[PDB]
Structure 1
Amino acid sequence: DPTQFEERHLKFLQQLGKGNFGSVEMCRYDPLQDNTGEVVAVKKLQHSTEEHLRDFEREIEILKSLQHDNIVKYKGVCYSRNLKLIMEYLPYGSLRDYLQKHKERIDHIKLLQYTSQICKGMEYLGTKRYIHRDLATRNILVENENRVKIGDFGLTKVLPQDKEYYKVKEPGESPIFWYAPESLTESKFSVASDVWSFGVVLYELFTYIEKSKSPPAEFMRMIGNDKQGQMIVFHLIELLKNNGRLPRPDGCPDEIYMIMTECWNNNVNQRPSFRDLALRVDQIRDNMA
């Protein structure tokens, strides 16, 4: 049974990233002990407390239920009752790191390949009634020059059967610079708040991840760098409610700026669908090709 991985055969190779309650490591699954076994990504909990183990086991079922070209591939689990999630290893790292390293050597046509792929993983995700909540280029991974995948689901929620939003009553980690207004004010997440975050990803891509231009740097400038802690969220809400928005990235095509701004609509119902976004991005790619 290949989806059962023995703990004692997973050899630590390298640390890949950490956040909040988890980390991901590159490991070799080497049960022949001759360094020839498969290299894999392993997610585990940093503080494997009871409540986090239950959240993480639901995160694992989330990922196992997803099969899509632009979602990272589940391989299995490792039981010791601590839990390691086993995934394919994607060797070009996170899209945030990748773009920052190759920056303009990646051209507009390539950025839109990535954008289309991202959009299509999200659209698929939404057909299972999952809300990602953390869509940002740091959570997208690069398989090779032609393929990116959504690569972490640690904040992902499942919508209630009878509701189109999930309200998070005691928020933990919150990437508030990527959040829709309603998510800031009422902690409500929906496909439409994922679409809002996707306009932020498009922004990230077209700024080539220039740090002085990142969403946190730009929003902090607009509300004033003196704002701190919970005042950031107060002033960010006021800013967004008054149409303050991230700027058009330098050299961004018009049609691409129009899409970000349409994803950043205050009116939830006026944000585009991921299905229409993929249609539109692939049209733009076609026009450019």
Structure 2
Amino acid sequence: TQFEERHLKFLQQLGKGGSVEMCRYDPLQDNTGEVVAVKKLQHSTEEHLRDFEREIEILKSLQHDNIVKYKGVCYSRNLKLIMEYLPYGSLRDYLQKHKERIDHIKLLQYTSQICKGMEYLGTKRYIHRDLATRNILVENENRVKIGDFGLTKVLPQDKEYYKVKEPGESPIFWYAPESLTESKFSVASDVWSFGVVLYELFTYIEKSKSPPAEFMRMIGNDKQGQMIVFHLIELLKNNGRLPRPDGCPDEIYMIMTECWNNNVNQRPSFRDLALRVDQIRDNM
């Protein structure tokens, strides 16, 4: 079923990736249409549009409780991706709003769900490359979803990693060492990122304890540009890690540090992590 240009009514800006907007699809003109989320490119050029195209094929092929629902495409050659509107917004902002009102068993509900979405994403040999709580969204109290795939890559047939030859924006404070030195991206480096996401959850996304704040302190605030990359590689090669979050129980911190293993072979699988997290939840 089609989405006509003329019947997308702008409601609100939501954020920058493209840009993401809240719209009413109102083909009946009485404002009874569904509210949806629209992703559109900001500088649609032949290279970047092919990317957005590949990304849409990625999302459309993904069907899971914890991945945002693809709804359709809007044409005029210029693309608007139409997605379900998840009413509780960005997980990053939701955790900040309901600070400590969210207890440990609830944060583990969220952990488990993120984890399952990643495990499933692995069965199609996709690599997120951008797992971070500002790419997680909230549907309701009981339900979060991976909400963006702008940087996802597909594994090549014969390799278990992907080389990104000329990187664009790079969320380096979420990056595994091998990604930093070599641009090698794999399920295992998504696991590293998941560990950092677990860190984010348990700090309640308090900005003074965020990963960029914390690594910068460790390497010195006087580090700038490419020097940050150099020193972060060194720091991590020597087991410099994010601290245990304040109030974070032993066994959840344990999980993070297994994710942050320098040896890629020895990081856990998303399959084990989902079992592990659910075991803990039931124990509590």
Return the TM-score normalized by structure 2. Answer: 0.99
Q: Deviations over 1:159-191 (max 9, x none)?
A: 001110010000001000000000000001000
Alignment match of 1:39 (pick from 32, 35, 39): 35
Q: Deviations over 1:142-168 (max 9, x none)?
A: 000000000000010000011100100
The separation in 2 between residues aligned to 1:254 and 1:240, in whole angstroms, is 22
Deviation of 1:258 after TM superposition, in Å, equals 0.3
Which secondary structure does the structure 2 equivalent of 1:120 belong to?
helix
Which secondary structure does the structure 2 equivalent of 1:284 belong to?
helix
Question: Partner of 2:103 in structure 1?
Answer: 107
The separation in 2 between residues aligned to 1:153 and 1:43, in whole angstroms, is 11
Q: Deviations over 1:82-131 (max 9, x none)?
A: 01000000000010110011111000000000000000000000101000
Provide the aligned length of Structure 1 versus Structure 2. 284
How high is the sequence identity, in percent, across the aligned residues?
100
Which secondary structure does the structure 2 equivalent of 1:199 belong to?
helix
Which secondary structure does the structure 2 equivalent of 1:14 belong to?
strand
Question: Partner of 1:252 in structure 2?
Answer: 248
Question: Partner of 2:123 in structure 1?
Answer: 127
Question: Partner of 2:45 in structure 1?
Answer: 49
Which secondary structure does the structure 2 equivalent of 1:104 belong to?
coil
The 5 A counterparts of 1:233-252 are 233-252=229-248
Q: Deviations over 1:182-210 (max 9, x none)?
A: 00000010000000000000000000001
Deviation of 1:232 after TM superposition, in Å, equals 0.2
The separation in 1 between residues aligned to 2:163 and 2:255, in whole angstroms, is 26
Alignment match of 2:4 (pick from 6, 19, 23): 6
- The runs of 4+ residues in structure 1 deviating greater than 2 Å are none
The separation in 2 between residues aligned to 1:110 and 1:103, in whole angstroms, is 12
The separation in 1 between residues aligned to 2:230 and 2:93, in whole angstroms, is 30
The separation in 2 between residues aligned to 1:212 and 1:38, in whole angstroms, is 38
The separation in 2 between residues aligned to 1:201 and 1:34, in whole angstroms, is 42
The separation in 1 between residues aligned to 2:4 and 2:178, in whole angstroms, is 44
The separation in 2 between residues aligned to 1:83 and 1:242, in whole angstroms, is 45
The separation in 1 between residues aligned to 2:268 and 2:3, in whole angstroms, is 42
The separation in 2 between residues aligned to 1:94 and 1:159, in whole angstroms, is 28
What is the alpha-carbon root mean square deviation over aligned residues?
0.5
Deviation of 1:135 after TM superposition, in Å, equals 0.2
The separation in 1 between residues aligned to 2:67 and 2:152, in whole angstroms, is 13
The separation in 2 between residues aligned to 1:4 and 1:118, in whole angstroms, is 30
Which secondary structure does the structure 1 equivalent of 2:100 belong to?
helix
Q: Deviations over 1:239-282 (max 9, x none)?
A: 00000000000010100000000000000000000000000000
Deviation of 1:4 after TM superposition, in Å, equals 1.6
Which secondary structure does the structure 1 equivalent of 2:134 belong to?
helix
The separation in 2 between residues aligned to 1:182 and 1:4, in whole angstroms, is 43
Deviation of 1:224 after TM superposition, in Å, equals 0.2
The separation in 1 between residues aligned to 2:109 and 2:267, in whole angstroms, is 21
User: What are the ranges of 5 or more consecutive residues in structure 1 without an aligned counterpart?
Assistant: none
The separation in 2 between residues aligned to 1:261 and 1:159, in whole angstroms, is 26
Deviation of 1:141 after TM superposition, in Å, equals 0.2
The separation in 2 between residues aligned to 1:166 and 1:262, in whole angstroms, is 22
The separation in 1 between residues aligned to 2:96 and 2:258, in whole angstroms, is 26
Deviation of 1:9 after TM superposition, in Å, equals 0.5
The separation in 1 between residues aligned to 2:215 and 2:34, in whole angstroms, is 43
The separation in 2 between residues aligned to 1:87 and 1:212, in whole angstroms, is 33
Q: Deviations over 1:56-90 (max 9, x none)?
A: 00000000000000000000000011010000000
Which secondary structure does the structure 1 equivalent of 2:35 belong to?
strand
User: What are the ranges of 5 or more consecutive residues in structure 2 without an aligned counterpart?
Assistant: none
Alignment match of 1:278 (pick from 269, 274, 279): 274
The separation in 2 between residues aligned to 1:145 and 1:94, in whole angstroms, is 13
The separation in 1 between residues aligned to 2:228 and 2:259, in whole angstroms, is 22
Deviation of 1:230 after TM superposition, in Å, equals 0.3
The separation in 2 between residues aligned to 1:272 and 1:114, in whole angstroms, is 19
The separation in 1 between residues aligned to 2:106 and 2:119, in whole angstroms, is 20
